[PDB]
Amino acid sequence: LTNQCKMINEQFEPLVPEGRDIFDVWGNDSNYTKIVAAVDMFFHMFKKHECAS
Amino acid sequence: SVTVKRIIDNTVIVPKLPANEDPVEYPADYFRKSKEIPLYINTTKSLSDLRGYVYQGLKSGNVSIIHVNSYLYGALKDIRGKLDKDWSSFGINIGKAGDTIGIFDLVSLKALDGVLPDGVSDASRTSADDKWLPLYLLGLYRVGRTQMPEYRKKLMDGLTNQCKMINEQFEPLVPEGRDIFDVWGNDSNYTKIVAAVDMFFHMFKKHECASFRYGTIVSRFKDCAALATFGHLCKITGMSTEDVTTWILNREVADEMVQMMLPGQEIDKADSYMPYLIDFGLSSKSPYWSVKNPAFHFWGQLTALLLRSTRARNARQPDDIEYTSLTTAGLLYAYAVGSSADLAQQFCVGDNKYTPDDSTGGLTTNAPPQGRDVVEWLGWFEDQNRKPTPDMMQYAKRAVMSLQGLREKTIGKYAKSEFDK
Amino acid sequence: SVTVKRIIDNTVIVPKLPANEDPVEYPADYFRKSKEIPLYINTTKSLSDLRGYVYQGLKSGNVSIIHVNSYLYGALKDIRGKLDKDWSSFGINIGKAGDTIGIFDLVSLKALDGVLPDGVSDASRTSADDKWLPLYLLGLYRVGRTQMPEYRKKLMDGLTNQCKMINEQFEPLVPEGRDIFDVWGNDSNYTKIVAAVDMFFHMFKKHECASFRYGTIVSRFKDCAALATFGHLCKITGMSTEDVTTWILNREVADEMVQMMLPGQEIDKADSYMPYLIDFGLSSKSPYWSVKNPAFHFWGQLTALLLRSTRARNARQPDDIEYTSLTTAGLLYAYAVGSSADLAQQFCVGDNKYTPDDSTGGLTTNAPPQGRDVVEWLGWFEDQNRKPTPDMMQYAKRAVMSLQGLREKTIGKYAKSEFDK
Amino acid sequence: QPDDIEYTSLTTAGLLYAYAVGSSADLAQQFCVGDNKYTPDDSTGGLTTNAPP
Amino acid sequence: AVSDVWSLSKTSMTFQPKKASLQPLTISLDELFSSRGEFISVGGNGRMSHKEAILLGLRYKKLYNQARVKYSL
Secondary structure: OOOOOOOOOOOOOOOOOOOOOOOOOHHHOHHHHHHHHHHHHHHHHOOOOHHHO | OOOEEEOOOOEEEOOOOOOOOOOOOOHHHHHOOOOOOOOEOOOOOOHHHHHHHHHHHHHHOOOOHHHHHHHHHHOOOOOOOEOOOOEEOOOOEEEOOOOEOOOOOOOOEOOOOOOOOOOOOOOOOOOOOOOOHHHHHHHHHHHHHOOOOOOOOOOOOOOOOOOOOOOOOOOOOOOOOOOOOOOHHHOHHHHHHHHHHHHHHHHOOOOOOHHHHOOOHHHOOOOOHHHHHHHHHHHHHOOOHHHHHOOOOOHHHHHHHHHHOOOOOOOOOOOOOHHHHHHHOOOOOOOOOOOOOHHHHHHHHHHHHHOOOOOOOOOEOOOOOOHHHHHHHHHHHHHHHHHOOOOOOOOOOOOOOOOOOOOOOOOOOOOOOOOOOHHHHHHHHHHOOOOOOHHHHHHHHHHHOOOOOOOOOEHHHHHHHHHOO | OOOEEEOOOOOEEOOOOOOOOOOOOOHHHHHHOOOOOOEEOOOOOOHHHHHHHHHHHHHOOOOOHHHHHHHHHHHHOOOEEEOOOOEEEOOEEEEOOOOEEEOOOOOEEOOOOOOOOOOOOOOOOOOOOOOOHHHHHHHHHHHOOOOOOOHHHHOOOOOOOHHHOOOOOOOOOOOOOOHHHHOHHHOHHHHHHHHHHHHHHHHOOOOOOHHHHHHHHHHOOOOOHHHHHHHHHHHHHOOOHHHHHHOOOOHHHHHHHHHHOOOOOOOOOOOOOHHHOOOOOOOOOOOOOOOOOHHHHHHHHHHHHHOOOOOHHHOEOOOOOOHHHHHHHHHHHHHHHHHOOOOOOOOOOOOOOOOOOOOOOOOOOOOOOOOOOHHHHHHHHHHOOOOOOHHHHHHHHHHHOOOOOOOOOEHHHHHHHHHOO | OOOOOOHHHHHHHHHHHHHHHHHOOOOOOOEEOOOOOOOOOOOOOOOOOOOOO | OOOOOHHHHHOOEEEOEOOOOOOOEEEOHHHHOOOOHHHHHHOOOOOOOHHHHHHHHOOOOOOOHHHHHHEOO
16 A cells, blocks of 8 residues: 555545455456466566556 | 586586576766666646646555656756766766756656556645645655564654645555555656756755655665675774775675776766666666675675674675685674774874884784784684684674574674674 | 675675765865855844844744844944964965954845835834843854754853843743754854954954853864864873874774875864864765764763763763773773873972983883883783783772762773773 | 474584684775785684684 | 703803893793703704703793893893
8 A cells, every 4th residue: 555656646445444355266267377477577677667666 | 626526426427507697787887887867757638637647645555656756847847957077977968067957867758658657636726736745755765675673763754854845644544555555666657756866966966855765865875785784894993995894704705895896987977877776777687786786785784794894783684605714704703893993093293103113023922913904814813723722702692692682684683692602 | 805705605705894985075175166154144234123023032932043044244344453474374465564454354245135024023122232142142153053962051151241241131931942043053154254253353353242151162172072072082191182182992993093184174273263163064975973983982081981081971882892802901091191100290499300210120020011111011012912001990990989970882981891890 | 493304413404504604704895996815825824723614 | 961051051051131220130041941851842952052052941931022022142
């Protein structure tokens, strides 16, 4: 909640008690793991691009 | 020593690890491609209108950096400052012997229009221009960087200095008004302004508007902690740069030292761009960070700590380095220095002490060498079976014994639990 | 030592460091370019009005320094003193033979137009000027300076000497009503008034109004702390300035000593401008700051501490200095004087103990030199293999083991955590 | 700490390796101004070999 | 006694004070050494002269350099 403020606004989404009970589901979805890996692999090649952030 | 065989199987194995190829970016290589520093500021709004968005933007916590960057340009357009000599850095002749020059005299360009906020405005303040507001914008660059429990202490002297102008006031909030200006240092353009002001007033030292440097002075060598640690070691031992180099006894430290001392970076000359390599965007990976020189950093601080350094306690203990051998090398250096105070008469009223040669040998020499010649000490340590002496360990025990309230993962904490058993 | 080779690949390395060089500013050099110390007193309109603006300004915690300056000028304006001798400092002739002189006969002018609005005032106040109010405005120079809680002893002090004329009153509040007079010492006109008053009454010590010095006295030799420790060291050793100087055993300290003792700065003059070089704007970087002589400060205070000093306990430990060498030199010196009281009979009735018949017999020795000559002690120390003796160590232990309540980063804490174990 | 492994043997091997690394530091001159130290012939002597490698 | 220079151990030497009014230091080998072994331990030979033995002998109470600047030595 500091890197998202670099662009335009400061906004926070998840809550306190069940804040972590919604992200551990995502790691089970194989397509989501394929998305974050492909993104990381892409910018590992093109580090000088501004979207490397 | 390349091919490795498994004994039982009589089979070849190739030990290998993931690659690590993150090179450092040297200041000189920037000017080798780009011959001008870009600064994108949009001047669409007047001085009075730009003043309005910031005033309420610090209170509400909703402040656009574009408005700040435009306001900082419009409040520092002063062309004050006459040069008496040539000013050139990396083949860039920005000034000559005649010109009355100002800041922003690098390369100035314009940013694309499309600033969407433009909200929460106030036309109350008018005479609060070149007084207390712009100096406070530069001062929050200091406060935002430190993530230590030291927010009030950095907001103590970065507020009282502004009261000397008109009024004693503060805008950002106490609790939530601390995370707002942490976004500021991420903005490429704002950091270019902070470095440009501080560089300019480092040249024009005597100029009456040099007071801006308060809060701006922390940008100089801000990334160059590895040069600082080296500087600090020279002062703590009282030896020259050349001679401190010869007491490097570890290969990793030597490689790092070579990296830091690459010719043609203008490190030793005063008025240069290099002290603000990251801030200007000349570099994105500084060769002078203390994370890119981990072994030298560890060996430097530890030796300084054993020599009673007041700042080495809270220094960073780096990960993934050859601790044990770096510790022995540090202990030896510290021990040589601290057991050999080269005390000599400096002044006289007629008579003085002289002993160029009167030292007799023939088993008249059990004690460690007198002086700080690494060749001699490497001789002595060789005779000590390359193993630290009860006396070396006692020196270290005495050095760290009284350290209190140390923090985790520090060089002070390492040394204490290493030498006080 | 210039060229450093790396042994492995025979590459040349050039060890260098960032330049941190700010040349010290000597008092005499000011009068090389200017012949007058300008006192921009600005506004000088109605004492009765200024009285009211100031009185409420201190009560409401919002008073303009311009109003304070103008009030102080008009209150001390008429103070006169008749000279016996000539008065000159750094070439500039202040007074002649039998002239009648005021405190402000040190160059006065007018400047920037912009009088601060009413703010807060009341006409109810009578004529209690020369009575207590200006002394208060001079005495808050002392109060708004200290970091440690001593303002609850300094503001309380401004009540014994304040009420010599009329009743008892204190204007600034307890908690946040302190930062108002903190800033004053940054308005170069105000500091010039405090220094002038003091310098005037240091000359005319017999004047009836010499008690104005109860507020201005700490303005003198402020910014010359290094000279004080040099003086303190002479008084605690009992040696001459010349003898103490022969006991410098570190090059860094010698360098600093040469800096302080530059000829032609009127340091030992009776009534000079130099005890106020900063406040009078003669200098911006005092050659006689402890900060500009770190090694000497450490060496001096430690020696004094081991000699039972009641000042040194709380003396600030500097950083970036050769602590180990300095400590040993300090100890040796401390031990020399602490072993050699040099007791001698001073008075007789008809019989006195004679020493000129015997001072040293055959063989009866194995003890330290009985004088305080550097040369004999340097000779003795080299016989002791240049390492402090158990007895030197027990001496230091005994000197520091009894002191309690030490603060951080002080000479006291350093010595205790070095010798008490 | 993993389960189902031979702790006692891995400890001895680990102790010996660490003791070997810890006893013998790198320690060699890297830079020189005029003179430098060497010892590529002088190993021991000597029979004072009541010491580790 | 042995060795060749140890005979002179009982005979004393005198060194002239460097300062105007001081007493000349009268010293001997049997005063700087306890027996015989100490002399050979510190680095002594029989082929030594009486002075060279005495100068080496100024190491018992650790007082050579102090004597060096205080006496004709």
